[PDB]
Design an enzyme around this catalytic site. Sequence first.
Site, short mmCIF file in Angstrom:
data_model
loop_
_atom_site.label_atom_id
_atom_site.label_comp_id
_atom_site.label_asym_id
_atom_site.label_seq_id
_atom_site.Cartn_x
_atom_site.Cartn_y
_atom_site.Cartn_z
CG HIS B 33 -4.25 -2.10 -3.57
ND1 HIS B 33 -3.71 -3.19 -2.88
CD2 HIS B 33 -5.41 -1.73 -2.93
CE1 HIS B 33 -4.52 -3.35 -1.78
NE2 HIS B 33 -5.53 -2.52 -1.82
CG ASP B 63 -0.74 -4.75 -2.67
OD1 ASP B 63 -0.61 -3.51 -2.46
OD2 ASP B 63 -1.76 -5.18 -3.10
N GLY B 139 -11.91 -1.30 2.44
CA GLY B 139 -11.63 -0.26 3.45
C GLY B 139 -10.47 -0.74 4.27
CB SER B 141 -6.57 -1.94 1.05
OG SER B 141 -7.27 -2.81 0.20
CB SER B 156 -2.61 -7.27 -0.54
OG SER B 156 -2.83 -7.54 -1.93
#
Lengths: 51, 185
Positions: B33, B63, B139, B141, B156
């Site tokens: 993402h 992901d 933040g 991720s 994720s």
Amino acid sequence: VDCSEYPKPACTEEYRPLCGSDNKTYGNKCNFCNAVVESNGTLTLSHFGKC
Amino acid sequence: ISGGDAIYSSTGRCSLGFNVRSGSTYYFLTAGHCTDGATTWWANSARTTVLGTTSGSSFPNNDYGIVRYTNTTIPKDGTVGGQDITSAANATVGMAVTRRGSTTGTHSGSVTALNATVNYGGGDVVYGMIRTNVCAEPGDSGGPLYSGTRAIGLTSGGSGNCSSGGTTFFQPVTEALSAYGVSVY
Ligand SMILES: [K+]
């Protein structure tokens, strides 16, 4: 931002801040929009970016 | 720069998962993402220090994303903060893990379930995810999830927060490593 497709059970964790009417910086629109729902529609967008 | 450190794209901030390599070529994994629609990555908000450019991105469905390093001087530690990482492994129910992320720093917890489906809306659905009781916030991720010296996954997303508790789902890191033909070092 439109929070009509909310709520959502999960949010990705990327950071693109939104500033709420409660003066809280929301980490992302997904976080921001779930709070609007939890607030039962009382919380609004103040501006984009950090409060 | 190491696992859990902040990375800046042109849109926002994410966290560096793991530094990986193939031959003499260095990369780093992060969340899909985050690599989706991003080209260049910098090491700071001022965007003055270049990291590299996106080399792959798989999201939704999976992901994970990978970034090729274009910076020649930046140190590329094979760690998570100071934590040395020596291999990757498969998550298992009950496994004790730790997540490091650019916003919340380090938090621990365990794996509560595997092969989880997370629905982020509008068709963004991710499959085969590791469910855990570890919190995470915006933040964080793409940051690492490890267990001791073992690489396990990439952050994720999920629900909750670190103050009140939450559930975060992680992409298996083994899946990414195989896809890219890279390995941890
Ligand atoms: K969260």
